[PDB]
């Protein structure tokens, strides 16, 4: 319908997440600026990547272990993926850390897929995670100012000017 049907958050999220998955899966630390996403996209990208790569390393056995179990081979693996997301949000608690983990796990999956040259499942997975992650609690994204709130909450005592 009107403006209430438009989702500018979706545009930014799709942009940031798909890019994040592609740069992470290829090991490309040099990703094109979030100009088409938003000013806060850059801060979100650097923060999301640092936390994502960090939680994976801090929990190598847990993250790599769970990753080995959820090996993508067909479209049927997408259904279980959403269930894993729903499993985390099962209590109804919408927090940024839970969003970063869901994206970090997805990033690890993309990294794993790229390693076996399964790009055909990476693109759909990135978009699926984005839509499912954003649509499940889009009302929360709006309340938290989207990625702007993500960088604000994840980086409270930030210097900003340096």
């Amino acid at each position: 319908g009107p403006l209430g049907s438009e989702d500018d958050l979706y545009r930014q999220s799709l942009e940031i997440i798909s890019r994040y998955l592609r740069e992470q899966a290829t090991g490309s630390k040099d990703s094109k600026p979030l100009g088409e996403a938003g000013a806060a996209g850059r801060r979100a990208l650097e923060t999301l990547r640092r936390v994502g790569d960090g939680v994976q390393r801090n929990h190598e056995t847990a993250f790599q272990g769970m990753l080995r179990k959820l090996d993508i081979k067909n479209e049927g693996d997408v259904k279980s993926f959403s269930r894993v997301m729903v499993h985390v949000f099962k209590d109804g608690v919408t927090n940024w850390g839970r969003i970063v983990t869901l994206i970090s796990f997805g990033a690890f999956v993309a990294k794993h897929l790229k390693s076996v040259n399964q790009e055909s499942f990476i693109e759909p997975l990135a978009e699926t995670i984005t839509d499912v992650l954003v649509r499940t609690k889009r009302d929360w994204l709006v309340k938290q100012r989207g990625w702007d709130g993500f960088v604000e909450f994840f980086h409270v005592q930030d210097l900003e000017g340096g």
Binding site: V51, V55, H59, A62, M66, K69, L70, S80, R83, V84, M85, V86, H87, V88, K90, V93, N95, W96, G97, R98, V100, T101, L102, F105, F153, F154, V156, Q157
Partner: peptide, 27 residues
Amino acid sequence: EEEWAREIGAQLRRIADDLNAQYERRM
């Protein structure tokens, strides 16, 4: 059947919950 998914979802939960709690309460 579901056990594997339960632990996987719970693991990401355990990690995520403590992670966000760090900023949630302590600022």
